[PDB]
Amino acid sequence: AQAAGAETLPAEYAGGQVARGARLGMLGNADVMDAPFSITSYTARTIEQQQARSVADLLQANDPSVRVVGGRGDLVDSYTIRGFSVQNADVAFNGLYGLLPFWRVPIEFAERVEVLKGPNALLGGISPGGSVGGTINLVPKRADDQPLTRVSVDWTQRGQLGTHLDIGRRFGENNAFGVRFNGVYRNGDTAVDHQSREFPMLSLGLDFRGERLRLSSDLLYQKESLEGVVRPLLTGPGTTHIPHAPDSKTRFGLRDSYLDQEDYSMVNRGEYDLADNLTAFASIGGRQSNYETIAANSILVGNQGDIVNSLARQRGDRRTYSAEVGLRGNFDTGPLRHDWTLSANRLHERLGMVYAFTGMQSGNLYQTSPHTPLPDFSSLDGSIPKTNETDLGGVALADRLSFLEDRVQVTLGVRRQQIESRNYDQTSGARTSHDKRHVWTPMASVLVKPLQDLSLYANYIQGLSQGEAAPMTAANAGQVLAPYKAEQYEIGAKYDLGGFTTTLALFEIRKPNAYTDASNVFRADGEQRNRGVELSLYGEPLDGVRVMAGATYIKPEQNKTGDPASEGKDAPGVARRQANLGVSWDTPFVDGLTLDSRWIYTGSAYVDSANALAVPHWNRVDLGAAYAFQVAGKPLVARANLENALGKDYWTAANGYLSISSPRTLSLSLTADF
Ligand SMILES: O=C(O)c1csc(-c2ccccc2O)n1
Ligand SMILES: O=C(O)c1csc(-c2ccccc2O)n1
Ligand SMILES: [Fe+3]
Ligand SMILES: [K+]
Ligand SMILES: [K+]
Numbered sequence: 001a002q003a004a005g006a007e008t009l010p011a012e013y014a015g016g017q018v019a020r021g022a023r024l025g026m027l028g029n030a031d032v033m034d035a036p037f038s039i040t041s042y043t044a045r046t047i048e049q050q051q052a053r054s055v056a057d058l059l060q061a062n063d064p065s066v067r068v069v070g071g072r073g074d075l076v077d078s079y080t081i082r083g084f085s086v087q088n089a090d091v092a093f094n095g096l097y098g099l100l101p102f103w104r105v106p107i108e109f110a111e112r113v114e115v116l117k118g119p120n121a122l123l124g125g126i127s128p129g130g131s132v133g134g135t136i137n138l139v140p141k142r143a144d145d146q147p148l149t150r151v152s153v154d155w156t157q158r159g160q161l162g163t164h165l166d167i168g169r170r171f172g173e174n175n176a177f178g179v180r181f182n183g184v185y186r187n188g189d190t191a192v193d194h195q196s197r198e199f200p201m202l203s204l205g206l207d208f209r210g211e212r213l214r215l216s217s218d219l220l221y222q223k224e225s226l227e228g229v230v231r232p233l234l235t236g237p238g239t240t241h242i243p244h245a246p247d248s249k250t251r252f253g254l255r256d257s258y259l260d261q262e263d264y265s266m267v268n269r270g271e272y273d274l275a276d277n278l279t280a281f282a283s284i285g286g287r288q289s290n291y292e293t294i295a296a297n298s299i300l301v302g303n304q305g306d307i308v309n310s311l312a313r314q315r316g317d318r319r320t321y322s323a324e325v326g327l328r329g330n331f332d333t334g335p336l337r338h339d340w341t342l343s344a345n346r347l348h349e350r351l352g353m354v355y356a357f358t359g360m361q362s363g364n365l366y367q368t369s370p371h372t373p374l375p376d377f378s379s380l381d382g383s384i385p386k387t388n389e390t391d392l393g394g395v396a397l398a399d400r401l402s403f404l405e406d407r408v409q410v411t412l413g414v415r416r417q418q419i420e421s422r423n424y425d426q427t428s429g430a431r432t433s434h435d436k437r438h439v440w441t442p443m444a445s446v447l448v449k450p451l452q453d454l455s456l457y458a459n460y461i462q463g464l465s466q467g468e469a470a471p472m473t474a475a476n477a478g479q480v481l482a483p484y485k486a487e488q489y490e491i492g493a494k495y496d497l498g499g500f501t502t503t504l505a506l507f508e509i510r511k512p513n514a515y516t517d518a519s520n521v522f523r524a525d526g527e528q529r530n531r532g533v534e535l536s537l538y539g540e541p542l543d544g545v546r547v548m549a550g551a552t553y554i555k556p557e558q559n560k561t562g563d564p565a566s567e568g569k570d571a572p573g574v575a576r577r578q579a580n581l582g583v584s585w586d587t588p589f590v591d592g593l594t595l596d597s598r599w600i601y602t603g604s605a606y607v608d609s610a611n612a613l614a615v616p617h618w619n620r621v622d623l624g625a626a627y628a629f630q631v632a633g634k635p636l637v638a639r640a641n642l643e644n645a646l647g648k649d650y651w652t653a654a655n656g657y658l659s660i661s662s663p664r665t666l667s668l669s670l671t672a673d674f
């Protein structure tokens, strides 16, 4: 069947650090040179080589277009992509939303971590968090035919001890069935003052390989428990400048904070080839997410480095269902080949989320905080009441027209997207809001291959975000606005020299934003207009020398505000320049030895809409090494990764707050295949 390849895992590219292709949502997997989008897919090889544990670890080290807000000391990572914030809750799982750990995705069970840059509502529907900067997609591990019995042990500053089992088996006639299990247990003191972390994780990738039938089921369990929670530093009404970043080992937030975050999910997927030119597919999954924390956000007071920590307890019970069904077919109209996809999806979520802010405790950026009182938060004990219900569902039809022996490709699609949410007050249980909307959202793209190894492309595509509720201060307080429609135009070029590829892209993304005006009326009358250029090179351009290099330049314009002080200024939290350079070098002179280095750069950015508060540019250097050897006939690999090797301390800017950098962090690991 022609559509039977939609879920086929893309081959690794030269060097094995990235893959040749990635998911285009409802369209399934596309080769990089057939994709009229900027897509990058990082491999398990890279994940294991750099000892990346989370999406954030991997993406900020390697990708010129992804920067992380929060960080591994915090309970939550978020990602900025093409000048827009992308929630970790909007990370996709084989294209499906709502099924991965809500605050921080671990990737030690991942075969691929893909980045599709820019919005993609036509391809995937709306994301639960409304993100539009890009879609990160995780592809889970599957069992290969040759059995895998892999064990590794690892140490990470200051005392985190870990073990990782990666076991794969196939069985049944013709290895029709596969089982891949990943188990991680990592526990101990982190690199940050007075912080410890416990991390159990279990995953099973199950699949069935049949003549006209393909099935899979993914089960995931994970918990992250932190003693000590790093949190944002907020700007105050009279902040005049951003103080110099403290030592990243210092922890200036709530000393006796804690996080207990548990997620588990199951997702079953299938395809069935009804004919040579018709394939049915369906997915159904669910996720439970349990959230418990007491922590404090730091607020600048004065400008000498004093802070006040604002304490809170938060509790969450989130229950998500996420499903898709559809058909993929193909036919011809003369010289046109049609490859069409009809897809429908549905996400349904029930959330209980209670919180109480109590306590304001003085501190200082440059002092690890002392033990301070924890307020009585017992009124949140017991059952967590329902506070929100979300229902997203859509139907999409897309057609890829192939002309002139597939050297010209035109893709058209439209999706009808339904959005519905209901909110209930955490104390009274009163129904505070019921938002219900539908929107149509289209795409158009064209790709031309003048050379076999040169692809030129353009796309138009939209992003969708649920409208915001007006703050309980404005004239229309509580009213939640119409959905925000972001719009992207992109053009680019991709050139595949065989062992390495160079890409270029120019994009614009326009998105409405909401502010309270002079009439204290909350309206969606603002607009952000991000215009950017992206360049990258990746591959193995010399034998035994792999290179991933990229840079981006963006003008992130607040091109419509209700304010002259901010009109035309830069969106906060969006550096105009970012670049990454990674080199991995198989030394010709030591057998089995590989040396890695990375340089991450982020230019100056602002925290405020008026741009009166700039944060400096920053640089991070990583050093790595891998040593492959044999003992008793079995392969072993010893690894070392030194993140932030120079021990630089820096702020990452966001809109209204800053996240402190993670300190210099060595991890060491030994892996054996039995
Ligand atoms: O209710 C909350 O969780 C809440 C209110 S402001 C806030 C906040 C504001 C800036 C940065 C991080 C934050 O967590 N958080
Ligand atoms: O989105 C947010 O505002 C958010 C996410 S965790 C969080 C938080 C967690 C512990 C204490 C205070 C907080 O504000 N806040
Ligand atoms: Fe918060
Ligand atoms: K991390
Ligand atoms: K996690």
Ligand SMILES: [K+]
Pocket: 120, 121, 124, 125, 126, 127, 131, 135
């Ligand atoms: K999306």
Ligand SMILES: [K+]
Pocket: 152, 153, 154, 162, 163, 164, 669, 670
């Ligand atoms: K390991």
Ligand SMILES: [K+]
Pocket: 070, 071, 072, 073, 074, 230, 231, 659, 660, 661
């Ligand atoms: K942080």
Ligand SMILES: [K+]
Pocket: 620, 643, 644, 661, 662, 663, 664
């Ligand atoms: K760092």
